[PDB]
Amino acid sequence: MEMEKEFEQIDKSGSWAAIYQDIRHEASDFPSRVAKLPKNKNRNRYRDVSPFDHSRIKLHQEDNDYINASLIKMEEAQRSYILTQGPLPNTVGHFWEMVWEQKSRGVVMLNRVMEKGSLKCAQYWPQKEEKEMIFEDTNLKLTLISEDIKSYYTVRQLELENLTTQETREILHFHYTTWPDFGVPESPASFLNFLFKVRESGSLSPEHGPVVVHCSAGIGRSGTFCLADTCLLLMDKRKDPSSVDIKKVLLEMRKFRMGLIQTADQLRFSYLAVIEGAKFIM
Ligand SMILES: CS(=O)(=O)N1C[C@H](O)[C@H]2C[C@@H]1CC[C@H]2O
Numbered sequence: 001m002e003m004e005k006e007f008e009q010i011d012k013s014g015s016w017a018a019i020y021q022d023i024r025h026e027a028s029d030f031p032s033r034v035a036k037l038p039k040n041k042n043r044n045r046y047r048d049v050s051p052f053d054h055s056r057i058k059l060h061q062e063d064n065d066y067i068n069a070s071l072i073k074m075e076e077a078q079r080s081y082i083l084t085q086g087p088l089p090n091t092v093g094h095f096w097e098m099v100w101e102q103k104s105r106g107v108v109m110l111n112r113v114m115e116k117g118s119l120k121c122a123q124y125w126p127q128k129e130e131k132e133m134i135f136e137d138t139n140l141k142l143t144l145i146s147e148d149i150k151s152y153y154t155v156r157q158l159e160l161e162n163l164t165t166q167e168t169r170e171i172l173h174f175h176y177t178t179w180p181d182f183g184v185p186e187s188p189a190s191f192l193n194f195l196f197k198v199r200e201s202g203s204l205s206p207e208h209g210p211v212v213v214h215c216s217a218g219i220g221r222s223g224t225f226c227l228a229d230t231c232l233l234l235m236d237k238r239k240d241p242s243s244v245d246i247k248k249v250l251l252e253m254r255k256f257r258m259g260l261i262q263t264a265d266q267l268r269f270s271y272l273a274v275i276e277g278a279k280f281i282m
Contacts, residue, residue, distance in 0.1 A: 002242045003242070003244070003246060003271060003274065003275055004275050007271050007272075007275060010268075016264040016265075016267060016268050017264045019247070019264070019267065020261075020263070020264040020267050023247060023250060023251065023254075023261070023267070026251060027251060027254040027258070028251075028254055028255045028258075030052040030053070030054055030055075030255075031052065031053050032050035032051060032052050032053060032056075032258075033053055034053055034056065034066055035050035035051055035056075035066070035068065036050065037066075039064065040064070040066045042088070042090050043066055043067065043068060043088070043090070043091055043094070044068050044085070045068070045085045045086065045088055045216065045217065046085070046217050049068070049085065049217045049218070049219060049258070049259060050068065050258070051068055051069060051070040051257060052070065052256070052257065052258070055070045055071050055072075055073075055255075055256040055257065056069065056070060056071075057069040057070065057071060057082060057084075057098055057102065059094060059097055059098065059101070060097075060101050061097075067084070067091065067094050067095070067098055068084060068085045068091075068218070069082055069083065069084035069085075069098060069212075069218075070082070070083050070084070070218075070256055070257035071210065071256065072226060072253055072256040072257060073256065074230050074252070074253070076234065076237075077230045077233045077234050077237070078206070078233075079204065079226075079229065079230055079233060080210040081210055081211055081213055081226045082098070082102065082104070082210045082211065082212045082213070083213055083214070083218045083219070083222050083223070083226065083257050083260075084098075084212060084213075084214045084218045085121075085214060085216070085217055085218040086111060086120055086121025086122070086214050086215065086216045086217075086218070087121055087122045087124045087214075088121075088122060089122050091122075092122050092124045092135060093135035093136070093137040093138040093140065094137075094138065095124060096124075096135055096138065096140050096142060096160060097135075097138040097140065098212070099160065099171060099212055100140065100160060100162060100169070102209040102210060102212075103208060103209030104171070104203075104208065104209040104210060104211060104212050105170075105171065105172060105201070105202060105203045105208040105209070105211070106171070106172045106173075106174060106198060106201060106202075106203025106204070106208075106211045106212070107171060107172070107173050107174070107211075107212045107213075107214075108174045108176075108198060108203075108211055108212070108213040108214070108222075108225060109173065109174070109175045109176065109214060109215075110176050110179060110213070110214070110215040110221035110222060110225060111179065111214075111215045111216050111221065112177060115181050115216075116181050120215075120216040121214070121216060125142065125144065125156065125158060125173060126142060126143065126144040126158075127144065128144065129143070129144050129145070132144070134163075139162070139163045139164050140160060140161065140162060140163060141160070141161040141163055142158060142159070142160055142161075143158065143159040143161075144156065144157075144158060145157040145158060145159055145170075151178075152176065152177065152178045152190040152193070152194065153174065153175055153176045153177055153178070153190075153194050153197070154173075154175045154177055155172065155173065155174055155175070155197070156172070156173035156175070157170060157171075157172060157173075158170070158171040158172075158173055159171075172201050172203055174194070174197065174198050174201075174203070176191070176194050178190065179221060183265060184265050184266055184268075184269040185269070188269065188272050188273035188276050188277070189276070191224075191228075191273060192228075192273060192276065192277050192280070195225065195228060195229060195277075198211070199229075204229070213225055213226060217259075217262075218257075219257065219258065219259040219260050219261075219262060220259075220260075220261065220262035220263070220266055221266075222260075223250075223253070223259075223260030223261045223262075223266070224261065224266055224269060224270050224273070226253065226260075227246070227249060227250055227253060227260070227261065227270050227274075228270055228273045228274055228277065230249055230253070231244055231246055231249055231274045232274060232277050232278065232281065234249070235274075235278055235281070236281065241278065244274075246270065246271060246274060250267075250270075
């Protein structure tokens with residue numbers, strides 16, 4: 001079926017939970033043996049969210065190459081994404097090592113450091129220009145260059161230096177700051193505006209490594225971001241845009257990381273975002 005009228009048909013019939021459970025039943029199951037090794041317990045935030053072995057990102061290190069991060073490669077859309085958990089106190093150096101090694105331009109953050117009165121990720125970037133951060137375990141230096149605070153999101157320019165080689169690179173930090181503590185946003189308008197700002201920066205384009213996108217677990221809000229982006233690109237590329245099937249795209253993405261889209265409300269919100277976004281594109 002088309003999207004916008006499939007949407008009204010699920011609303012009128014109140015069957016979002018049943019649609020979402022079908023997706024959960026059909027989703028891929030692949031091994032995640034490296035994630036579950038005892039030496040990696042303090043590298044995982046949640047025991048039930050792990051990268052698959054076949055798609056995990058490897059650190060360029062011989063001691064321990066493990067990080068909780070996955071490469072989502074979308075062949076028809078010609079887009080790739082790295083989805084990862086919010087960094088932990090003992091993985092902030094690994095996080096920036098990955099950004100460096102994978103040649104990423106942008107980092108997309110969809111959570112606040114504290115939500116619901118608890119810490120959802122480490123404070124992994126510097127908050128003042130004159131107070132830079134040094135990660136001794138991976139030999140990187142990170143400096144805040146500039147910060148632009150807007151009503152729904154903040155953009156930061158950061159400088160990452162590889163202290164071994166003295167090479168430097170400019171990284172863009174895109175921080176969506178207004179996702180509610182509970183539920184999903186009422187309108188997709190600010191989320192779509194944010195997606196378009198990430199696109200306009202070059203951070204999603206083939207001349208750079210994959211964008212790094214995270215929330216707390218790296219599957220819910222993060223899944224919504226890449227699902228909406230890929231569906232909109234396919235609608236632009238194809239002769240028949242109504243042939244794009246958001247459930248089939250989501251199942252394709254779940255071949256590369258488990259659990260993408262965590263609730264039926266996030267699934268409904270993803271439909272809403274693609275529907276509204278397809279009208280603005282033209
Ligand atoms: C009722 S439903 O399955 O169609 N679905 C929508 C409804 O508004 C409730 C409960 C469920 C999931 C999200 C929430 O908004």
